Design an enzyme around this catalytic site. Structure first.
Site, PDB file in Angstrom:
ATOM      1  N   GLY A   1       3.342   5.948   9.576  1.00 26.03           N
ATOM      2  CA  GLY A   1       4.683   5.766   9.071  1.00 26.03           C
ATOM      3  C   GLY A   1       5.446   4.595   9.656  1.00 26.03           C
ATOM      4  O   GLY A   1       6.619   4.416   9.316  1.00 26.03           O
TER       5      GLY A   1
ATOM      6  N   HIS B   1       0.805  -1.214   0.000  1.00 20.85           N
ATOM      7  CA  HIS B   1       0.000   0.000   0.000  1.00 20.85           C
ATOM      8  C   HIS B   1       0.843   1.271   0.000  1.00 20.85           C
ATOM      9  O   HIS B   1       0.269   2.364   0.032  1.00 20.85           O
ATOM     10  CB  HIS B   1      -0.993   0.025   1.171  1.00 20.85           C
ATOM     11  CG  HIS B   1      -0.375   0.191   2.526  1.00 20.85           C
ATOM     12  ND1 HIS B   1      -0.343  -0.823   3.461  1.00 20.85           N
ATOM     13  CD2 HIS B   1       0.204   1.263   3.117  1.00 20.85           C
ATOM     14  CE1 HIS B   1       0.233  -0.384   4.567  1.00 20.85           C
ATOM     15  NE2 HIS B   1       0.577   0.879   4.383  1.00 20.85           N
TER      16      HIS B   1
ATOM     17  N   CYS C   1       4.441   1.449   9.174  1.00 21.79           N
ATOM     18  CA  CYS C   1       4.222   0.309   8.297  1.00 21.79           C
ATOM     19  C   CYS C   1       5.539  -0.146   7.683  1.00 21.79           C
ATOM     20  O   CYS C   1       6.414   0.662   7.368  1.00 21.79           O
ATOM     21  CB  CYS C   1       3.229   0.678   7.199  1.00 21.79           C
ATOM     22  SG  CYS C   1       1.565   0.851   7.834  1.00 21.79           S
TER      23      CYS C   1
HETATM   24  C1  ALD Z   1       1.427   2.597   7.609  1.00 28.16           C
HETATM   25  O1  ALD Z   1       2.400   3.207   7.951  1.00 28.16           O
HETATM   26  C2  ALD Z   1       0.089   2.937   8.243  1.00 28.16           C
HETATM   27  C3  ALD Z   1       0.203   2.757   9.767  1.00 28.16           C
HETATM   28  C4  ALD Z   1      -1.179   3.105  10.405  1.00 28.16           C
HETATM   29  C5  ALD Z   1      -1.073   3.022  11.951  1.00 28.16           C
HETATM   30  C6  ALD Z   1      -1.571   4.541   9.986  1.00 28.16           C
HETATM   31  N1  ALD Z   1      -0.992   2.076   7.766  1.00 28.16           N
HETATM   32  C7  ALD Z   1      -1.808   2.448   6.591  1.00 28.16           C
HETATM   33  O2  ALD Z   1      -1.582   3.456   5.997  1.00 28.16           O
HETATM   34  C8  ALD Z   1      -2.944   1.518   6.154  1.00 28.16           C
HETATM   35  C9  ALD Z   1      -3.091   1.522   4.625  1.00 28.16           C
HETATM   36  C10 ALD Z   1      -4.357   0.686   4.261  1.00 28.16           C
HETATM   37  C11 ALD Z   1      -4.548   0.645   2.722  1.00 28.16           C
HETATM   38  C12 ALD Z   1      -4.178  -0.756   4.805  1.00 28.16           C
HETATM   39  N2  ALD Z   1      -4.197   1.990   6.730  1.00 28.16           N
HETATM   40  C13 ALD Z   1      -4.494   1.799   8.163  1.00 28.16           C
HETATM   41  O3  ALD Z   1      -3.709   1.263   8.877  1.00 28.16           O
HETATM   42  C14 ALD Z   1      -5.818   2.299   8.741  1.00 28.16           C
HETATM   43  C15 ALD Z   1      -5.507   3.254   9.892  1.00 28.16           C
HETATM   44  C16 ALD Z   1      -6.835   3.537  10.642  1.00 28.16           C
HETATM   45  C17 ALD Z   1      -6.542   4.523  11.797  1.00 28.16           C
HETATM   46  C18 ALD Z   1      -7.833   4.166   9.636  1.00 28.16           C
HETATM   47  N3  ALD Z   1      -6.538   1.169   9.294  1.00 28.16           N
HETATM   48  C19 ALD Z   1      -7.608   0.520   8.524  1.00 28.16           C
HETATM   49  O4  ALD Z   1      -7.919   0.938   7.457  1.00 28.16           O
HETATM   50  O5  ALD Z   1      -8.251  -0.615   9.075  1.00 28.16           O
HETATM   51  C20 ALD Z   1      -9.533  -0.879   8.543  1.00 28.16           C
HETATM   52  C21 ALD Z   1     -10.536   0.173   9.080  1.00 28.16           C
HETATM   53  C22 ALD Z   1     -11.221   0.930   8.229  1.00 28.16           C
HETATM   54  C23 ALD Z   1     -12.221   1.970   8.755  1.00 28.16           C
HETATM   55  C24 ALD Z   1     -12.393   2.107  10.063  1.00 28.16           C
HETATM   56  C25 ALD Z   1     -11.599   1.241  11.051  1.00 28.16           C
HETATM   57  C26 ALD Z   1     -10.737   0.343  10.594  1.00 28.16           C
HETATM   58 MG    MG Z   2      -0.207  -3.276   2.039  1.00 27.59          MG
END
Ligand code: ALD
Ligand code: MG
Ligand code: ALD
Ligand code: MG
EC number: 3.4.19.12
Lengths: 300, 300
Positions: free
Chosen positions: B141, B39, B143
């Site tokens: 960040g 991603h 990930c």
């Molecule tokens: C990478 O560095 C980052 C770390 C997170 C702690 C921000 N992860 C992402 O960017 C990741 C990309 C997607 C395409 C997997 N998104 C998430 O981790 C996201 C963060 C939450 C706070 C929104 N989690 C997520 O999408 O889980 C599913 C979801 C969707 C909607 C509501 C609750 C959970």
């Molecule tokens: Mg991914």
């Protein structure tokens, strides 16, 4: 919210093995000096009542065996500084990081790289207790393992492990050989004295809980510094000062919760217990996170 | 008895920064391949419903910026494997340790080197929950941070961080890109499902308590596997098997306490609570220590 240690790689490159007689323990190799607990020169009989000056006089440079991995360091000088031995070697450690020696205060935290025979075993995060002990995991041969903090690229060494005072409670020195607390490096029974809970750390952790969505414990009350410290003394918590209030400033401002408001909540946690509930996945008030630790883990 | 992570130095030498567009995260640099979450190619809008095949087709080698410290790696190939991107670079990592890629089982533990912008922040010890989530500390960040175990000199990489499902619960893949559990790398709400307590880990920790002098919880009763598992189901503990009994063998033999005897003690802990008391400094039953973790920390 996890208890996080510093990355240990910079310290791993400084661990060596020190042998004198049959006793072997860990040494810290920085520049052309190896630091280790002076009781490496003791026999088991010696440890009951050592005269370290007399015992060291019977040792020469060639009775100290220093091994960095599988290469052996040539010892060209030895010196006692307080409770630490400094072995001058003929080779500067090429992996020497930028470093300082610091003496930490009670209630501050640090990472311990537990080592055996000069080899790293694990890393964990510790607090220097108010009574100057550490609650760690140290088996025989772990002496000379060091505690440290990292500021960007500079390792601040603050602790070296010397002894187990009792099950699960340990004592040691700074890197100048001065013990934290009243302890001596002798196998005679020694009291650590009453410990206390690190109030400012508990408050920081409660802020960590609020930052992470855990807020059931927040109540309708406020309190005063003096009113709270009366409750603190009854529960063997350290008195809270305005210095401590100031250090909590980042967390109070991040959450919109006044420090005295959180003290009121803590006071009711103290007098009423936790009622089977949980804060950040724990059923007791955690006091081994400093305010900086919390800001750090919430800042990345 | 502390929760101990592995020394992280060997992993620190493999962390790099990966940027594609405005998104930046961590990559694992091993030999001439950099591994990272796929991603990284997504915009914020993309993450709500990504077509990764279509999105990756619009990227060429030169849209991937890989930075190891301050030196920049030349990307000469890119490939999607499941949920991981593999960036072929022109330089083998000279700090590459001996390593394997392994897929761990629920209830096993590992160390996480939390990183930001390719730079290590901290290390902590995690368990893969029975529902295939991890309870960690991961900010934006992080990930691409990886989970690992070390066997002497060989790093077994087992986890790469991809996403936060909810406050304090995280999901990720093995190093082949296969998610642990049913999760997908898309920003849509996803259920993790009921978690359970890792029974064999709780038992190992109770043995750790006995080894460390903590034994108030030991009782006058014994029980049977079937009788205990009836109590286990009511409290959402995993069923105990003879495989689990076997793995506890070192601890049962070290303490002289039969596993079924300890199960009886655990059963009474479960039905009666802990009554304000403490085990190894905790007021809840700890389940993120494997039997091997306990033997390890008691073996040095
Ligand atoms: C990478 O560095 C980052 C770390 C997170 C702690 C921000 N992860 C992402 O960017 C990741 C990309 C997607 C395409 C997997 N998104 C998430 O981790 C996201 C963060 C939450 C706070 C929104 N989690 C997520 O999408 O889980 C599913 C979801 C969707 C909607 C509501 C609750 C959970
Ligand atoms: Mg991914
Ligand atoms: C170093 O590797 C080793 C680690 C210990 C965990 C074994 N430490 C020592 O060898 C150290 C040397 C003496 C001269 C300081 N001794 C101890 O640490 C000793 C271990 C206990 C289990 C005896 N602790 C000690 O002496 O504390 C004072 C004491 C004396 C008698 C009874 C209780 C406590
Ligand atoms: Mg000494």
């Amino acid at each position: 919210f996890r208890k996080m240690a510093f990355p240990s790689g910079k310290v791993e490159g400084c661990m060596v093995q020190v042998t004198c007689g049959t006793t072997t323990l860990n040494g810290l190799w920085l520049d052309d000096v190896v630091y280790c607990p002076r009781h490496v020169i003791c026999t088991s009989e010696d440890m009951l009542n050592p005269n370290y000056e007399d015992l060291l006089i019977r040792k020469s440079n060639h009775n100290f065996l220093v091994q960095a991995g599988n290469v052996q360091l040539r010892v060209i000088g030895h010196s006692m500084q307080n409770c630490v031995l400094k072995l001058k070697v003929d080779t500067a450690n090429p992996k020497t990081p930028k470093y300082k020696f610091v003496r930490i205060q009670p209630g501050q935290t640090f990472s311990v790289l537990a080592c055996y025979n000069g080899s790293p075993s694990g890393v964990y995060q510790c607090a220097m207790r108010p009574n100057f002990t550490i609650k760690g995991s140290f088996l025989n041969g772990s002496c000379g393992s060091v505690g440290f903090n990292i500021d960007y690229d500079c390792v601040s060494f603050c602790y070296m492990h010397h002894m187990e005072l009792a099950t699960g409670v340990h004592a040691g020195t700074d890197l100048e050989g001065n013990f934290y607390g009243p302890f001596v490096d002798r196998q005679t029974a020694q009291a650590a004295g009453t410990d206390t809970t690190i109030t400012v750390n508990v408050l920081a952790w409660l802020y960590a809980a609020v930052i992470n969505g855990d807020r059931w414990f927040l109540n309708r009350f406020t309190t005063t510094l003096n009113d709270f410290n009366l409750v603190a003394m009854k529960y063997n918590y350290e008195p809270l000062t305005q210095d401590h209030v100031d250090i909590l400033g980042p967390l109070s401002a991040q959450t919109g919760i006044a420090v005295l408001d959180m003290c009121a909540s803590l006071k009711e946690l103290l007098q009423n217990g936790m009622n089977g509930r949980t804060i950040l996945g724990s059923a007791l008030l955690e006091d081994e996170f400093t305010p900086f630790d919390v800001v750090r883990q919430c800042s990345g």
